[PDB]
Every structure is written in structure tokens, then in C-alpha cells.
């Protein structure tokens, strides 16, 4: 099934974005005075709460590239969760047509 | 109907996650200097604003396990709300095919 295939592809891609985003955020934020997103472990946590939209506000990017990385994490997170929902819709719709006799 | 069954199963599971997550967060956060998520009543409120994504930022986990618990709460919340939406889609789609004559 395509909907379950694209969903799985979205989840694995999300994990890649989370890891890479955690790596790129630190690389981008270091060098800017006052930045807190400068260590990998908490950067990964930041990526999670960002991708899930959430955004406690305990950690936030202050640089241009750190914020661009953030946007990518947001979109990847929203798209994946939106794709899972879309996949769940197809499963339920296809199932309802079966118990109806259509 | 499956879509209404999985939705109800998601809502009751969400409540379980909220309660357990409120319990596990306190257990994980206590022992870490500076942690505020250390009492059950406000921990439950934290779980609610976390599961609904949202995240005011008044309460936030600082430990590894407290943050892992948070992620579970997030996913459970997002999945449930995404499953409700998917169930609402199936209801409307199945209804539109009826008033159309298909």
C-alpha cells in the first residue's frame, strides 16, 4: 500500500532530519554569543519538540542558519504527521466501504 | 465502525498516557537540581499541554528520561488527534457518497 509506504518513508526521513538537524543546529549556533543550542544531546531534544510543534521555548535558535534548520525540522515534522493522518484516513475509508458492501 | 473504534481506543489510551506520563515525569525529574516537573498535579497539566502540542513553556523536563516520557506523550497526543481527524474524514466521505447517490 502506498499510504503505508509513504508513511514509513516519512517516519524514517523524520529520524534522519532530527539527527542531522541536531547536528547542523549546533554547527550553526556555535559562534553566536548567547546561543544555548550548542550541545548535541539537548539539540536532539530541541529537534523533537520542534518537529512535534510543541516548542516549549527552553531552547531556541538565534542565527539565520540555525533558524533555517529549524524550519526544515518543522516542515519535515508537520509533513510526516500529516502524512500519517492521511494514511490513517485511507485505511478507515477503504474499511468503511467494505463493511458497507461497496 | 473501525474508525470510531480506533478513535475511542485512542482517546482512552491518551488518558492512560497522560496519567502514567504525569507519574513517570515526576519520578524521572526528581533528583535533578533545578527541575520543576516534580509534583503530580502540575505534572498532569504539563502532560495535557504537551499532548495537545500547546507547550506554554511554564513546565519542561530537563532529564533524559523525563524528555523521553515527554516524546511519548507528544506522539500519543498527536496520533490520537490525527486519528480523530481521520475518523471524521471517513464519516464525511461516506456521507457525501450517500447524498450523491453513489
Amino acid at each position, epitope marked *: 500500500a502506498l499510504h503505508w509506504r509513504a508513511a514509513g518513508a516519512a517516519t524514517v526521513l523524520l529520524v534522519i532530519v532530527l539527527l542531522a538537524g541536531s*547536528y547542523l543546529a*549546533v*554547527l550553526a*549556533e*556555535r*559562534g*553566536a*554569543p*548567547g*546561543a*544555548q543550542l*550548542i*550541545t*548535541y*544531546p539537548r539539540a536532539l531534544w530541541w529537534a523533537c519538540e520542534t518537529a512535534t510543534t510543541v516548542x516549549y521555548g527552553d531552547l531556541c535558535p538565534v542565527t539565520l542558519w540555525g533558524r533555517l534548520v529549524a524550519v526544515v525540522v518543522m516542515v519535515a515534522g508537520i509533513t510526516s504527521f500529516g502524512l500519517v493522518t492521511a494514511a490513517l484516513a485511507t485505511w478507515f475509508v477503504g474499511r468503511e466501504q467494505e463493511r458497507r458492501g461497496h | 465502525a473501525l474508525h470510531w473504534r480506533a478513535a475511542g481506543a485512542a482517546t482512552v489510551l491518551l488518558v492512560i498516557v497522560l496519567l502514567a506520563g504525569s507519574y513517570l515525569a515526576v519520578l524521572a525529574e526528581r533528583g*535533578a*537540581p*533545578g527541575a520543576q516537573l516534580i509534583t503530580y498535579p502540575r505534572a498532569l497539566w504539563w502532560a495535557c499541554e504537551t499532548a495537545t502540542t500547546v507547550x506554554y513553556g511554564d513546565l519542561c523536563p*530537563v532529564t533524559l528520561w523525563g524528555r523521553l516520557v515527554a516524546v511519548v506523550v507528544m506522539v500519543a497526543g498527536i496520533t490520537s488527534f490525527g486519528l480523530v481527524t481521520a475518523a471524521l474524514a471517513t464519516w464525511f466521505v461516506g456521507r457525501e457518497q450517500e447524498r450523491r447517490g453513489h
Partner: antibody
């Protein structure tokens, strides 16, 4: 084994330049940052700058004079600090340290005693 | 940038007595503070990471505490080998900064 190997000493004439080395061993991750710390005789530790060998990007302490230039060689796992236009102020022991990207300096080098004199 | 204040600069104490080093940050840095030990003509050595976490190889004599602004490095019953300079370092905000340091005398 010694994780960070630095030269014992470096003698530099006033105005000249010097390229300090920091050969690294042990476990090496892409998340590793190499830092440099300056310590003048009778003074405390002073952060100079940092560099990530896996990407090559470097940051410097902008609170002090820009005397250093950080480069790295991923082939030999050795970090370098280019000090130029040295005066008597730059005469100090320069340590290099490894950070696993988690904030603390796990291991330090023996330090290179740089003396600026004619 | 974050200023780390270590007072007093020199700390005198009798043998076999508990001692405490102070480190105060100009801003709230949670528990992102790290302690180092530097003996005469030696390189700095990590004693405590993240305010209170122990390090492999370091005697159980050393301990750490504190959060936010005030931090403390403690030594239960000091020994002669503890004679050194003690520095604190924060990793909460860029750039990383060191304290002025505290000298221990017996």
C-alpha cells in the same frame, strides 16, 4: 594512550608566526570539537577558540585580540593553530582539549610552552 | 558573555577537613558547570561534569552541587595531593568561559 599530543615548546621572534599542532588519538567522532586554551604565567585558563574537524568550521573568542587561525587535518587527525604577529603578551602555555560536543573538556594535551623573544 | 566568579581566590584548610569551593555565574546556567583540577606544571583534569556528576578515575572524595547561579565543589577531608588550582567552566551559552580559579592550601 595519550589522546592529545602537543610539542613541548616553541620559540618565536617578535612579529613572526608559529603553527602549533595537536595530534589526536583514541575514539574520534564527527561530533568532536577541538578547543585551544591560553594560560599566561601566574594567570588562569583563557578560551581562545574551537574547531570541528569533521566540518572544518571554527569559532574564536571575540572578547580578545584575533591572533589565532584554526585549521584541521582529518587525514592525520591533527589540529592546528596559526598564531601571527606575536608579542610578549602571547608568551604562554597553549593547551588543546577534546570536547565530545557535550560541553566539557574530557581530555587535555600536555600544552605547548610558547616563548616570544629575540 | 557569562562571567564565572570564584571567591575566595585562596582557600586555607587543615588536613582531614571538608572544604568547599565557590563558583557563581552572572546568569542562570542550570547545571551546565564543570570543575577542573590543575596541579603545579600539570594540565587541567576533569573532576566533576554537569555540577554533580562523578568522573571515572576521580576519588569519591570529590563531590559537586548547586544549580542555576551558585555552584559548589566539595572535598571531604582534604589530602596533600589535593593541593592545586581549581577552575569552573560553563557550557550553557556560547562562548564557553572559565572562572578565575581558586588555590587550595593546607
Amino acid at each position: 594512550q595519550v589522546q592529545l599530543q602537543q610539542p613541548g615548546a616553541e620559540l618565536v621572534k617578535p612579529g613572526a608566526s608559529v603553527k602549533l599542532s595537536c595530534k589526536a588519538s583514541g575514539y574520534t567522532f564527527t561530533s568532536d570539537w577541538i578547543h585551544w586554551v591560553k594560560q599566561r604565567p601566574g594567570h588562569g585558563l583563557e578560551w581562545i577558540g574551537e574547531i570541528i574537524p569533521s566540518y572544518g568550521r571554527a569559532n574564536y573568542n571575540e572578547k580578545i585580540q584575533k591572533k589565532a587561525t584554526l585549521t584541521a587535518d582529518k587525514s592525520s587527525s591533527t589540529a592546528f593553530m596559526q598564531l601571527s604577529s606575536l608579542t610578549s603578551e602571547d608568551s604562554a602555555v597553549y593547551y588543546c582539549a577534546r570536547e565530545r560536543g557535550d560541553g566539557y573538556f574530557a581530555v587535555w594535551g600536555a600544552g605547548t610552552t610558547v616563548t616570544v623573544s629575540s | 558573555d557569562i562571567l564565572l566568579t570564584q571567591s575566595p581566590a585562596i582557600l586555607s584548610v587543615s588536613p582531614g577537613e571538608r572544604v568547599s569551593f565557590s563558583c557563581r555565574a552572572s546568569q542562570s546556567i542550570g547545571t551546565d558547570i564543570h570543575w577542573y583540577q590543575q596541579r603545579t606544571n600539570g594540565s587541567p583534569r576533569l573532576l566533576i561534569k554537569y555540577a554533580s556528576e562523578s568522573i571515572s578515575g576521580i576519588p569519591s572524595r570529590f563531590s559537586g552541587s548547586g544549580s542555576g547561579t551558585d555552584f559548589t565543589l566539595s572535598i571531604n577531608s582534604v589530602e596533600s595531593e589535593d593541593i592545586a588550582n581549581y577552575y569552573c567552566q560553563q557550557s550553557n551559552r556560547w562562548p564557553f568561559t572559565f572562572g578565575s580559579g581558586t588555590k587550595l592550601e593546607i
